[PDB]
Design a protein around this nucleic acid. Sequence first.
DNA 1: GTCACTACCGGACA
DNA 2: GTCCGGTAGTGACT
Length: 63
Amino acid sequence: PVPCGWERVVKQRLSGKTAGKFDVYFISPQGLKFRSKRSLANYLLKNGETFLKPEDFNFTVLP
DNA sequence: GTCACTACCGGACA
DNA sequence: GTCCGGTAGTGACT
């Protein structure tokens, strides 16, 4: 599927020599756009890790 | 070498 | 944000 919080966009070319071809790109949770597997792989090298802390979870109900 | 194809990314657009 | 084209790379080959 699509990794959590990420978005996948699919498009099809409609004119010119490349009509009918498809373009795919991804949007990260922070809104960074990747048009290629190469630029995304490069980004993932150092940025693919995600961490969690207790403070990220709310166990309380307000008034 | 040519052909067919896939992938990346430049850059036009006002 | 919208959109296509030019180039590089790969691999099979009458």
